[PDB]
Amino acid sequence: AFMSQMMQMYQQVGPAQFSAMIGQFAPYFASIAPQFVELRPGYAEVTFPKRREVLNHIGTVHAIALCNAAELAAGTMTDASIPAGHRWIPRGMTVEYLAKATGDVRAVADGSQIDWQATGNLVVPVVAYVDDKPVFRAEITMYVSQA
Amino acid sequence: MSQMMQMYQQVGPAQFSAMIGQFAPYFASIAPQFVELRPGYAEVTFPKRREVLNHIGTVHAIALCNAAELAAGTMTDASIPAGHRWIPRGMTVEYLAKATGDVRAVADGSQIDWQATGNLVVPVVAYVDDKPVFRAEITMYVSQA
Structure with a gap:
């Protein structure tokens, strides 16, 4: 839909x-200065840089900045994947902090196992990495309805 | 008594x-304002403004999560004994309604034994015009230093 079409259109033009x-157009996402590596129905991958602005009190990437990347990947993938006649709204999210995030982050939302044509709750998984090692996991529950 | 409380007492909200x-730069992204902080309770507001909007013009869900983390974390640091330490393990949130105005996030430590160690689940509710729009439970593991 519109959200994913915007992300794609501009990912293609430049950082x-x-x-x-x-x-x-989605202001708060700018707080982590993200970029999409890939975006298509069923898959989204975003990256954002480590910089002073996204740190916590121990100088590592802030837990909530990681959540922001997860929301961007999961939400944009959902928008790109459900039928045009359906609508989606995030209703819940559970995250686990696996390790300190000490560098640039890559968040992957693998939607290959979700039935994107189904209405109801769809649980989108996201794993965030630093230097190819997992540092964070989230599951964002999207309520999808024909609407 | 607590170090963070000493600090809060000295400089004011x-x-x-x-x-x-x-101290934790990412919290500045929401321009938070403490209303109250004491052992067992933290209350923080943040303004609805361009910077914290989502693509539909309401307050971004993750800006709410940031306020929850700030309130729960500061309440925890301010409430546990000096010889104890804490670290968040994870969090579960529910999005109840669109947030269409200034937000008030309240971390409620009224029923938590702040002297206990092990897992403590801190509840947070965020309101807009006094109505709940969001809830979170952030699990902190507290141990002896």
């Missing part, structure tokens, strides 16, 4: 343009 | 708000 677009 | 945003 600085994608950054300006997200700052204007 | 407005200044403490600027300090926490300095």
Whole structure:
């Protein structure tokens, strides 16, 4: 839908343009300065850089900045994957903090196992990595309805 | 008595708000303002403004989560004994309604034994116009230093 179409359109043009677009059209995501590596029905992958602005009190990437990346990947993938006649709304999220995140983050939302044509609750998984090692996991429950 | 309480007592809520945003920068992304912090209770508000909006113009779900983390974390640090330490293990949240105005996040430690060790589940509710729009439970593992 619109959200994923925007993300895709601008990921294809360039990073600085994608950054300006997200700052204007889904503002809070700009707080982590993310970029999409890949986005298509059933799969989303985003990255964001480690920088002062996204740190916690022990100087590692903030737990909530990781949640923000997860929300961006899961939500955009959901928008790109359900039928155009359906709508989605996040209703819950559970996350676990596996390790300190000490560098640039890559978050992967694998939607290959979800029945995207189904209405009701769909649970989208996300794993975030630093230097290819898992540091965070989330499951975001999207309520999908024909609407 | 607590180190964080000593700090809060000395500078007052407005200044403490600027300090926490300095200490853990990502919290500054929501421009939080403490209303109250004491053993067993933390209350923080943050304004609805351009910077914290989502693609539908309401307050972004993760900005709410950030306020919850801030309230639960500071309440925990302020409430456990000096010789104890804490660290969040994870969190579960529910999105109840769209947040369409300034937010008030309340970490309720009224029924938690702050002297206990092991897992403590801290509940947070965030409100807009006094109505609940979001809830979270953040699990902290507390141990002896």
